[PDB]
Curated annotation (Swiss-Prot):
Any GO molecular function: protein-exporting ATPase activity
Binding residues for ATP: M74, F75, Q80, G98, E99, G100, K101, T102, D487
Name of the protein in question: Protein translocase subunit SecA
Encoding gene (name): secA
Record EC number: 7.4.2.8
One Gene Ontology CC term in the entry: plasma membrane
Outcome of mutating K96N: Can restore growth of E.coli secA mutants
Domain of life: Bacteria
Length: 772
């Protein structure tokens, strides 16, 4: 009291703001709905003036806090206020399961949605994206803000509409795919997305760590060409057994030698086969080579009804649907003289990781992120902020139990479930593979135990099931990816029984996953036990140290009859687990480097491309591309060092820029390249001014606008593909000791040069020649 007011801080940034917001809690306590709502208009004014989101934060969150209470009945605990603050800072709020992560997000979503730039709230699947949007939207609309739901089944129009709302719920995939499409548009107005302001990712460690490199692809409705496969195969019939190519015994590895390499360079009329401009050609020869030397007909595959069918080596049984990849199937189709069925071509591509970084602001939530903090900082520049639970966790996380054989471990799981089932306490068996869920289910049916099995198939159907897993008698086998996001509240008479008993069947590659399973119990403060069963036979127990240890236990005489539960053991296991998590981080880190090569290239091209679409006049640009294109032509024929500059370039110009027979005797001969370039450029300019004004002015700007886009997109496609072929075969271009990364960066840079020149020569011919 008085002794207190006189004393009045060792509180952190979040404990504070949470208290401030709690203080001004009555200044909205009795306000009126219309008045509470008008608060938005107010915040918007102040922001218009000069205030910042940080400024209004304390009040904004107070508004939402009251708003919720009225609209939902829930008054945002103080822990939750701290979470919102963390999110607003562009960081990761780590709130254990059950803490109210969803509601927690409405705080910073609202705040960052006032400037009118839109805010994306991302989820794992449309069910959750639709539920949240549906439930939380009721709060935002209350404070006069429009919530939009962006789904896969929506039309370019209806999408654009939701991407226009203040807030927009969606899923990682849709957001990604829309982005690729907005980047294939012909008219700036065909896009759906607004600049990527700020995204708030739920289940963020799953989206940015686990599914980070998930590829989002837009393939081509049309097909690829087949001419090269033929040429490549025809060529391979030329070569000989040893001085033309090598063939490894153990591995089916096949390589070309200097002779074949020269015979190839000779055969296809090219200086360098390793030249980045011929990556596709070199790749085709390696498959056509593989198809003739490492794939035997009637043993590796068969030819039936004009096709190539993969024979399962030992079972002699055909695998009717599948093909070989990286064009090896087309290589064999060519060899066997069959109809070459070509693959479709990728037109646009991007990973979740490289898509989310296009944003201006990012924030995420998950109950499990601390372990990956470092990665989050370096890649997404986000920090993990651990928000304290609303109530103290009283859940009894018993130490791992180890059996000798899987059968033993699984029998134990059933025994346990049974015992708990008899008392009537709920049980939720966590699993990692659906195959495993079924293993236990069969075991529970042999005991007469009624249960449910979730395999992340139908999310809504499963969500409902889960919601009833806290009820007395319930028994649920859920596969790691099932039920995510649905709170299991305890049924009447359940805490009195011990709360939810969680039973883990294996430790996952990442402790995070094990902790997510643990977290389903001990919700707000509810009682509950978690227990993991493992066997010496599990995948992890055969790893690093785990081996040595289990080796010793085996020699010690351990049986299924009696499990092991030692702090020395359980910690030696924990030691491996960390090591596994170590290397997995090292790999990710390495792959980040390769992924970046194409990433930076894509960001550049898209930017340049958007500029084209968002440009009214394009002639200066096209002219430049022609200049460059041309300078290259002349340089091709004017060796800066039997003959001193032969000439044919003439017909190369009359056939590529001017018209047939427009020049030859004109200023070309003995001259200097420096000269020939400007002379021929004028001819071109009048030739363009002519076509320009003479055949259609506005029609020229659009004649251009199209000819360029098609040029970019066309070459990008080729690039994405050659860039892939290069990566796949970069160990072939790198030397023994050398690290391929460098070689990939270098050639990857060299190919981009190639791709710009290719874009240039195309937009050069087409513009100066063809008519609309
Ligand atoms: N401030 C609150 N007051 C009362 N209940 C809340 C509050 N915040 C969240 N909840 C409840 O917590 C449960 C789980 O919420 P959820 O947002 O899904 O959190 P999480 O994602 O961590 O599990 C829901 O039943 C939700 O209604
Ligand atoms: Mg959630």
């Amino acid at each position: 009291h008085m002794l207190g007011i006189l004393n009045k801080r060792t509180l952190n940034r979040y404990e504070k703001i949470a208290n401030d917001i709690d203080a001004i809690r009555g200044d909205y306590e009795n306000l009126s709905d219309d008045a509470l709502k008008h608060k938005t208009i107010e915040f918007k004014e102040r922001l218009e003036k000069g205030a910042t989101t940080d400024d209004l934060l304390v009040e904004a969150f107070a508004v939402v806090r009251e708003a919720s209470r009225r609209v939902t009945g829930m008054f945002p605990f103080k822990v939750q206020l701290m979470g919102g603050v963390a999110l607003h800072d562009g960081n990761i709020a780590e709130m254990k399961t059950g803490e109210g992560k969803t509601l927690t997000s409405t705080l910073p979503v609202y705040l960052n949605a006032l400037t009118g730039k839109g805010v994306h709230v991302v989820t794992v699947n449309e069910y959750l994206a639709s539920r949240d949007a549906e439930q939380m939207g009721k709060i935002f609309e209350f404070l006069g803000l429009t919530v939009g739901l962006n789904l896969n089944s929506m039309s370019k129009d209806e999408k654009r509409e939701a991407y226009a709302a203040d807030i927009t719920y969606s899923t990682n995939n849709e957001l990604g795919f829309d982005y690729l499409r907005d980047n294939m548009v012909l008219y700036k107005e065909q896009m759906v997305q607004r600049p990527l302001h700020f995204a708030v990712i739920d289940e963020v460690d799953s989206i940015l760590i686990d599914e980070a490199r998930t590829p989002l692809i837009i393939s081509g409705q049309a097909a690829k060409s087949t001419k090269l496969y033929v040429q490549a195969n025809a060529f391979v019939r030329t070569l000989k057994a040893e001085k033309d190519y090598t063939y490894d015994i153990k591995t089916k590895a096949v390589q070309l030698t200097e002779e074949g390499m020269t015979k190839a360079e000779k055969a296809f009329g090219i200086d360098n086969l390793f030249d980045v401009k011929h990556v596709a050609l070199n790749h085709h020869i390696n498959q056509a080579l593989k198809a003739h030397v490492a794939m035997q007909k009637d043993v590796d595959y068969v030819v039936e009804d004009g096709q190539v069918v993969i024979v399962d080596s030992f079972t002699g049984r055909l695998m009717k649907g599948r093909r070989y990849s990286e064009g090896l199937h087309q290589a064999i189709e060519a060899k066997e003289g069959l109809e070459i069925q070509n693959e479709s071509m990728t037109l646009a591509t991007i990973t979740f990781q490289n898509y989310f970084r296009m944003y201006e602001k990012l924030a995420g939530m998950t109950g499990t992120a601390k372990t990956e903090e470092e990665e989050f900082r370096n890649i997404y520049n986000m920090q993990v902020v651990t928000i304290p639970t609303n109530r103290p966790v009283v859940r009894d996380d018993r130490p791992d139990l180890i059996y000798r054989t899987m059968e033993g471990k699984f029998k134990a799981v059933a025994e346990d479930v049974a015992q708990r089932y008899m008392t009537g306490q709920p049980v939720l068996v966590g699993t990692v593979a659906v195959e495993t869920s079924e293993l236990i289910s069969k075991l529970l049916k042999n005991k007469g135990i009624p249960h449910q099995v979730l395999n992340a198939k139908n999310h809504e159907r499963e969500a409902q099931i889960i919601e009833e897993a806290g009820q007395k008698g319930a028994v649920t086998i859920a596969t790691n990816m099932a039920g995510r996001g649905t709170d299991i509240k305890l049924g009447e008479g359940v805490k009195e029984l011990g709360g939810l008993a969680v039973v883990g069947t294996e430790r996952h590659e990442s402790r995070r996953i094990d902790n997510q399973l643990r977290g389903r119990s001990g919700r707000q403060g509810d009682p509950g036990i978690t227990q993991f069963y493992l066997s010496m036979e599990d995948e992890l127990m055969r790893r690093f140290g785990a081996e040595r240890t289990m080796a010793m236990l085996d020699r010690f005489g351990m049986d299924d009859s009696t499990p092991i539960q030692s702090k020395m053991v359980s910690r030696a296991v924990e030691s491996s687990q960390k090591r596994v998590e170590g290397n997995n981080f090292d790999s990710r880190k390495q792959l980040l480097q390769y992924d970046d090569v194409l990433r930076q290239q894509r960001e550049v091209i898209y930017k340049q491309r958007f500029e084209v679409i968002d440009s009214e006049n394009l002639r200066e640009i096209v002219e430049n591309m022609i200049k460059s294109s041309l300078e290259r032509a002349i340089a091709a024929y004017t060796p800066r060092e039997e003959e001193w500059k032969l000439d044919g370039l003439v017909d190369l110009i009359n056939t590529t820029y001017l018209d047939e027979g427009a020049l030859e005797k004109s200023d070309i001969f003995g001259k200097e390249p420096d000269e020939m370039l400007e002379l021929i450029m004028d001819r071109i300019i009048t030739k363009y001014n002519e076509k320009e004004e003479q055949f259609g002015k506005e029609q020229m700007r659009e004649f251009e606008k199209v000819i360029v886009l098609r040029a970019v997109d066309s070459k990008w496609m080729d690039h994405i593909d050659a860039m892939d072929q290069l990566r796949q075969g970069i160990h072939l271009r790198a030397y023994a000791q050398t690290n391929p990364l460098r070689e990939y960066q270098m050639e990857g840079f060299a190919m981009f040069e190639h791709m710009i020149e290719s874009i240039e020569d195309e937009v050069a011919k087409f513009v100066m020649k063809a008519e609309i």
